[PDB]
Amino acid sequence: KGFVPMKAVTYGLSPFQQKIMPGLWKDLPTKIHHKVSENWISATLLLGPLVGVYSYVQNYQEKEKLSHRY
């Protein structure tokens, strides 16, 4: 647990000299599109098996119930 010699240069500005809130809602649709396009595969892989198993169980149960009738 130690540190390293670095050699960098940085500039900063005071907190009380810059607008804070307007950054949240600036350009939402492009951010939403980027997130969706990047994580569509993760969403698919998370939500696939649940839907498949649920549909299969529903179909099996209704078929069995309707086949037990008179």
Partner 1 sequence: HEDIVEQVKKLFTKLSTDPTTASQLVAKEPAIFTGSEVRMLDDEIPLAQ
Ligand X SMILES: CCCCCCCCCCCCCCCCCC(=O)OC[C@H](COP(=O)(O)OCCN)OC(=O)CCCCCCCCCCCCCCCCC
Question: Which residues contact ligand X by CB under 6 A?
Answer: 38-39, 41-43, 46
Alpha-carbon torsion, ordered 60, 61, 64, 68, to 10 deg: -170
42 touches, from ligand X, partner 1, none (C-beta below 5 to 8 Å by class):
ligand X
**Furthest C-alpha separation in the chain:** 86
Cα(48)–Cα(44) distance, rounded to whole angstroms? 6
Query: Whole-number minimum distance, CB 55 to ligand X, in Å?
Result: 20
With contacts defined by CB under 8 A, name the span among 11-19, 20-28, 49-57, 59-67 that binds partner 1: 11-19
Q: Is 12 near partner 1 (CB under 8 A)? A: yes
